[PDB]
Design an enzyme around this catalytic site. Structure first.
Site, short mmCIF file in Angstrom:
data_model
loop_
_atom_site.label_atom_id
_atom_site.label_comp_id
_atom_site.label_asym_id
_atom_site.label_seq_id
_atom_site.Cartn_x
_atom_site.Cartn_y
_atom_site.Cartn_z
N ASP A 272 -10.80 -25.22 -11.01
CA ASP A 272 -10.76 -25.94 -11.93
C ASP A 272 -10.05 -27.40 -11.45
O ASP A 272 -9.70 -27.18 -10.47
CB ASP A 272 -10.06 -25.32 -12.91
CG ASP A 272 -8.66 -24.72 -12.82
OD1 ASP A 272 -7.97 -25.05 -11.65
OD2 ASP A 272 -8.16 -24.18 -13.62
N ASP B 96 -6.93 -29.09 -16.96
CA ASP B 96 -5.72 -29.06 -17.44
C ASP B 96 -5.12 -30.25 -17.06
O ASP B 96 -5.13 -30.95 -16.05
CB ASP B 96 -4.86 -28.05 -17.00
CG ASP B 96 -5.34 -26.53 -17.40
OD1 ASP B 96 -6.19 -26.65 -18.48
OD2 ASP B 96 -4.89 -25.62 -17.03
N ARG C 154 -17.86 -22.66 -9.22
CA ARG C 154 -17.00 -23.18 -8.18
C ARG C 154 -17.06 -24.81 -8.39
O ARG C 154 -18.09 -25.05 -8.68
CB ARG C 154 -17.11 -22.71 -6.85
CG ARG C 154 -16.75 -21.30 -6.52
CD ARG C 154 -15.42 -20.81 -6.75
NE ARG C 154 -14.51 -21.50 -5.73
CZ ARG C 154 -13.08 -21.74 -5.98
NH1 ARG C 154 -12.51 -21.08 -6.72
NH2 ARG C 154 -12.59 -22.23 -4.68
N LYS D 271 -6.68 7.01 -2.13
CA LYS D 271 -7.95 6.60 -2.61
C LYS D 271 -8.97 5.95 -1.27
O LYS D 271 -10.02 6.18 -1.23
CB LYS D 271 -7.72 5.10 -3.48
CG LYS D 271 -7.34 5.84 -4.82
CD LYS D 271 -6.96 4.77 -5.86
CE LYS D 271 -7.16 5.24 -7.26
NZ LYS D 271 -6.38 6.33 -7.50
N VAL E 166 0.87 -1.23 -0.04
CA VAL E 166 0.24 0.06 0.02
C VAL E 166 0.90 1.16 0.21
O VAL E 166 1.66 1.42 0.98
CB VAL E 166 -0.95 0.16 1.05
CG1 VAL E 166 -1.66 1.43 1.13
CG2 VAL E 166 -1.79 -1.16 1.37
N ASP F 165 -6.33 -29.57 -12.06
CA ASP F 165 -4.95 -29.32 -12.50
C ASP F 165 -4.40 -30.78 -12.17
O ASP F 165 -3.84 -31.03 -11.19
CB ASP F 165 -4.09 -28.17 -11.88
CG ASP F 165 -2.93 -27.78 -12.57
OD1 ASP F 165 -2.61 -28.38 -13.81
OD2 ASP F 165 -2.15 -27.24 -12.06
N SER G 126 -5.09 -26.16 -5.11
CA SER G 126 -5.63 -26.12 -3.79
C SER G 126 -6.51 -27.16 -3.30
O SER G 126 -6.48 -27.58 -2.28
CB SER G 126 -6.87 -24.96 -3.70
OG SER G 126 -7.93 -25.04 -4.60
NA NA Z 1 3.36 0.46 2.40
#
Ligand code: NA
Ligand SMILES: [Cl-]
Ligand code: NA
EC number: 2.7.7.7
Length: 314
Positions: free
Chosen positions: A180, A235, A139, A62, A55, A182, A170
DNA sequence: CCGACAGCGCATCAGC
DNA sequence: GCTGATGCGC
DNA sequence: GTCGG
């Protein structure tokens, strides 16, 4: 806590990637969104957020505008912009990136319906992306992933019992859902038509339904469990045996874990990529790849305790 | 100030 | 026809 | 956009 802030940053990220074609600004906003999403306190000012890595001055400004007004003038204008919103939306189609999205919008093609009445202007990948637009954004519950793994492991062994196949991502880390599938594939005969025969069998049993791309080492396509289940992205990568477990490690992740493991490797005098683990000379000259026959071997090379995929979140 | 921020397989384009 | 670049996804 | 050489 900071969902308003992270949503704002994610939205900014997408527009940089898809409309401005500024991939590095996309990743900067994503990194900032990630670090804020983990921050265990409600942010009270941009200055507070500025202390976090990722950041900087612009994002802090912002955040200050967002906290005091509840919005971002810049974002509000972008959302309302027909050109920018259409370009951003079209990129949700797999195969349609910033460039194709821009060209489509330039010629008045702005919606899924517009894409449907202009099939001739779409390549094979994009037509598949359009066909399964909703399905690809869904998902995949772990239970379905298990059923999908059952089919893949079964058919692969049916082709040749010497293949080794591992579903990574995951899912391998124990995730309750996946985006997906893999699959990493290897065979003792392949070292530094093996893939084709596997894809062919998966098509024969009507598991694989479509093909986005396919070569000697990488397949990317679509699959579907028998019944109706949504079509899923799958994949399959064919990797040399001597590089297989380095690949499994890398594609299991997570991203943060891989980053941490590479850092520890260097501090122990090793460099780790998705392919090999190599030692470093006294000047930094990388030597020949070290022999690897399991994930644990990688850990033992850098004096680390073998971490179960379940614990590889960070 | 200014370069890095991942690199690569495949499909397809641009140029010869 | 070819080689190299680009777009895309991951 | 941010970080760091
Ligand atoms: Na920073
Ligand atoms: Cl290498
Ligand atoms: Na896309």
């Amino acid at each position: 806590l900071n969902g308003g802030i992270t949503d704002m940053l994610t939205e900014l990220a997408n527009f940089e990637k898809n409309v401005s074609q500024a991939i590095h600004k996309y990743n900067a906003y994503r990194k900032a969104a990630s670090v804020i999403a983990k921050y265990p306190h409600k942010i009270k000012s941009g200055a507070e957020a500025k202390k976090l890595p990722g950041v900087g001055t612009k994002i802090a400004e912002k955040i200050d505008e967002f906290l005091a007004t509840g919005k971002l003038r810049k974002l509000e204008k972008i959302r309302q912009d027909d050109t920018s919103s259409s370009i951003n939306f079209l990129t949700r189609v797999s195969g349609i990136g910033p460039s194709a999205a821009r060209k489509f919008v330039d010629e008045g093609i702005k919606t899924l319906e517009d894409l449907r009445k202009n099939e001739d202007k779409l390549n094979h990948h994009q037509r598949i992306g359009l066909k399964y637009f909703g399905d690809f954004e869904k998902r995949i519950p772990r239970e379905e992933m298990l059923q999908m793994q059952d089919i893949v492991l079964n058919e692969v062994k049916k082709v040749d019992s010497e293949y080794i196949a591992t579903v990574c991502g995951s899912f391998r880390r124990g995730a309750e859902s996946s985006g997906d599938m893999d699959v990493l594939l290897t065979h003792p005969s392949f070292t530094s038509k093996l893939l084709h025969q596997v894809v062919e069998q998966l098509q024969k049993v009507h598991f694989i339904t479509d093909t986005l791309s396919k070569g000697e080492t990488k397949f990317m396509g679509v699959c579907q469990l028998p019944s109706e289940y949504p079509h899923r992205r799958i994949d399959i990568r064919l990797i040399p045996k001597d590089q297989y477990y380095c690949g499994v490690l890398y594609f299991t992740g997570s991203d943060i874990f891989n980053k941490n493991m590479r850092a520890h490797a260097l501090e122990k005098g090793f460099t780790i990529n998705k392919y090999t683990i190599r030692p470093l000379g006294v000047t930094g000259v990388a030597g020949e790849p070290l022999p690897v026959d399991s994930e644990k071997d990688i850990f033992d090379y850098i004096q680390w305790k073998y971490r179960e995929p379940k614990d590889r979140s960070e």
